[PDB]
Symmetry: C4
Subunit: 247 residues, 4 copies
Amino acid sequence: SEFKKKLFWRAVVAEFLATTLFVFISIGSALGFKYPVGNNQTAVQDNVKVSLAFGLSIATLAQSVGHISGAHLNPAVTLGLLLSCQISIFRALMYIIAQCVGAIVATAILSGITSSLTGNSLGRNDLADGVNSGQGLGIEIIGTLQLVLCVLATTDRRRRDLGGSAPLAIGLSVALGHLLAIDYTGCGINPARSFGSAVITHNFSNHWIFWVGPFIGGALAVLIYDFILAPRSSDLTDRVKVWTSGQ
Amino acid sequence: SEFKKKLFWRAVVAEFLATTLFVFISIGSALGFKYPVGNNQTAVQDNVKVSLAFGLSIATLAQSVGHISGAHLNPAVTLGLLLSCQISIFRALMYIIAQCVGAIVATAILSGITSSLTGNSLGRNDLADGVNSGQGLGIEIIGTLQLVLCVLATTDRRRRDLGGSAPLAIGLSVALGHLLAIDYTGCGINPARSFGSAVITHNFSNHWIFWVGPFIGGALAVLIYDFILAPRSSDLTDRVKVWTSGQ
Amino acid sequence: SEFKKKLFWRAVVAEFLATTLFVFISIGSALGFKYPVGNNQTAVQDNVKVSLAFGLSIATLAQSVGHISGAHLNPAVTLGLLLSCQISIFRALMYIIAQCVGAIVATAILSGITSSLTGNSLGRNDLADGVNSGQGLGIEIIGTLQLVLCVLATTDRRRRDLGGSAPLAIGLSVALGHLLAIDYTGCGINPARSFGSAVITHNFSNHWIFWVGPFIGGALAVLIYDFILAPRSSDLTDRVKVWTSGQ
Amino acid sequence: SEFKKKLFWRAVVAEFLATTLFVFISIGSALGFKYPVGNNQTAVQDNVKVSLAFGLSIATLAQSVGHISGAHLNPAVTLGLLLSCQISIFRALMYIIAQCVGAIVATAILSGITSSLTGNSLGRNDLADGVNSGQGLGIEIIGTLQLVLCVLATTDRRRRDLGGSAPLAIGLSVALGHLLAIDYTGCGINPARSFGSAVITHNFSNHWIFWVGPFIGGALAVLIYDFILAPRSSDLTDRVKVWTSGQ
Ligand SMILES: CC(C)CCC[C@@H](C)[C@H]1CC[C@H]2[C@@H]3CC=C4C[C@@H](O)CC[C@]4(C)[C@H]3CC[C@]12C
Ligand SMILES: CC(C)CCC[C@@H](C)[C@H]1CC[C@H]2[C@@H]3CC=C4C[C@@H](O)CC[C@]4(C)[C@H]3CC[C@]12C
Ligand SMILES: CC(C)CCC[C@@H](C)[C@H]1CC[C@H]2[C@@H]3CC=C4C[C@@H](O)CC[C@]4(C)[C@H]3CC[C@]12C
Ligand SMILES: CC(C)CCC[C@@H](C)[C@H]1CC[C@H]2[C@@H]3CC=C4C[C@@H](O)CC[C@]4(C)[C@H]3CC[C@]12C
């Protein structure tokens, strides 16, 4: 069905390119504070700068490819939309693969560009001092929960009171998550974004947190928005059939 | 009437969950500047970061549950909407109870997560040096007045010139209040948000300010918007009947 | 005509109250960096905080009273709308008087609240070191020019491509002007806002700049938008009659 | 055709004036951190302030002259719209000339205003220490690519899901590019903006990067958005005829 449709592959390529741009721009803005290399200054990372960079990248790329691919740009958001029965399993898998490949390519290109930084971590997400696995896991769970909840509520298609720009809302949610989690874990929040940095830097220390926590948060957000707050008056079998049909 | 309706209880649970997420994310972003614990640095709290975190949390959760619960997320805003005769007394009481419980739960969860911080105040609102009870009370009154005025003017339902995103407007109002009041009192502005921190930290010093001042500001905003600027051409008895009817 | 209409006086009172809230909140956020008084720290004023406070105050109060008074909140913007023949002369004079009185009241209330600050200038706009009268005058002219141009283009009523929130656009224009002019002159940009601080602090040094420059910028913006970019296909006599008719 | 139309010349003058205002305000906000001159402090440039100034200037001027000139304000964006066959070659050339002249005039006026700064570079874009020609070229390419992609996707005219303010989206894209590239190259991103500073400061060191990289990024964005993601079902000859017809 969707395997032989041109629009599906265009959406996959759009997700790949937009994830590449998002990862590259956001991590490049995150690593900007270490420049100039020659100037010896005790520069402090600005959380507002990085959070706004992530949020505006999400908003801009969502405005770019919302009508083309739905503007997922996150394996956790894609998995949440799969669990809310909006996209097919094959589409979700292709989106996750494209996002991971794009993040890896973007991180490699940035590491080539930012090769002058000694000991460059390429914005790799890791636990800060004083934060163990459980606390960072909970922070990631809450951030991805609010992000997936915002995504689900924005793309409900049953609401006539919606106003403003949906890409702006998604970007502000991402920026909120970053303002929350940068000081704690660097705000992984995106399994592809952390996975690309882990692959390029050859460091997978505490990498399971940024793949499990976002998925748990997305699943909790789906459970809440679909069975507590705004239930849908449809049979479960029909929504399960969307996984094998994609419509 | 509303006691036996499923939608009312779904709205109450939505208010509870959204208040939990708001309090947790906002206070976690406020306490982020103290990390890493091992690194001994004279870190300075960024007011822009905390104000944007509060505002974007308000905007995101309002976008999430506006069609479900009305997106109050504030005992002062709920009391103002009660005094403007838009919601029933029972609904207002349930919203206040849910917001307080959610704030307490969020503060407890964050204190569990942020247990590594020595002498962690959990973002407890208190008077700064040089500010007495009256000055902080006035600052809180003005901030809650502008917030409740924005909420009332946005949800007027008689205006056809409204544009953009209403959750964005509410979030920007909250961020404005925080930019005003963080340096003075930490911008309590929300009786549930301060109440949860006071309960968890077992400190109620000058806690009456953050419960009286927001209520006074909300009442003043209701009085202004309903009897000076945009009066409603309806009898007072019919609006009083909304308290016992909820319609 | 308009002297005996209730809506005109409600609009005047709305302008007064919104200008009071704007001046109070914005200057209070500007003076926040000097707290705590007891703590001896070399605190540096954050231009982003003050600019965002001014912009969000403008946006929130415009969202509050746009349908009531038109949300001028600036003697320069009011004079520009008078010169673009949208409001009457009496309405413009009443708006200017109300804005000045509200700014004076707000500055007095804040000085009462911020009395603990030694040598508190109450956010009085003055020329910085290295900037003479001409340079600050030009900066104020450009800032008010872009602000009045944005106000005129937003409230054109002939454009069907308008989107988003107009109060948000006006607030972002104000924040842009502040990001431009805070380091130079403190971004007066509003004759009432500077006038209130000058009256309360009993200091009128270089105060003519903040009353002449904004007016010149507004007049230039009106001239441009009405005779170079988007001319109106109406006789000049009919537009002059709006000054004595108000319709 | 368009040479004898008044609206075309009004659009050209609007582009000139808006580019002048954009360059002047943005570079003035960028150079604000060096004041006061007499006060000897180790002031650090705030990237958030400069990025927000650029973005809000773009958004405000786009809101001002979108219905008049299309709000290009960038030779790279104008070239991208020419390559996407939306504007004529003569219109693109006139827009580029007007933008360059306006940027030169704005930089000269600001240098007159900011003459008190010793060794004032007038915000001239140059490679930072540790960044060679290739890395800065790639950063500029990516920033202009995302900017032109956002511009093309926003002004598609085939999308009915668009919401919010398009000038706000363009301004947020510009602010995102600045948050990315300020630490690396100062975020040239606009050939006119860098060209004016280079002409006024009489320094063209590494100036080819800020004229080649933005053009490459715009061309890549046009290629992507027009042949990979959202192809148009029209013959190439008809779109080529727009270059000589302008319709
Ligand atoms: C992503 C695309 C569209 C734009 C960026 C690609 C180009 C400009 C980038 C990507 C990889 C980069 C190279 C990566 C590594 C190095 C080694 C270093 O010692 C000198 C610079 C050099 C040789 C870089 C030059 C610029 C470069 C070729
Ligand atoms: C709110 C939900 C959905 C997510 C967060 C819940 C989980 C991940 C949090 C909440 C309470 C947390 C615990 C609170 C206290 C402590 C004691 C400390 O010495 C080690 C960590 C530990 C044991 C935390 C581990 C993580 C934890 C269990
Ligand atoms: C504007 C309205 C709605 C709210 C603010 C008004 C009230 C709370 C403010 C305005 C003026 C203020 C007073 C101004 C001056 C002083 C003197 C000082 O040594 C102690 C505090 C005291 C006595 C302030 C107390 C609080 C105060 C009374
Ligand atoms: C762009 C327009 C609308 C507003 C700005 C124009 C005016 C106010 C500006 C532009 C050029 C400026 C002059 C440029 C250079 C100098 C030399 C210096 O030693 C004293 C100030 C002085 C004499 C400036 C005074 C103010 C000035 C005349």
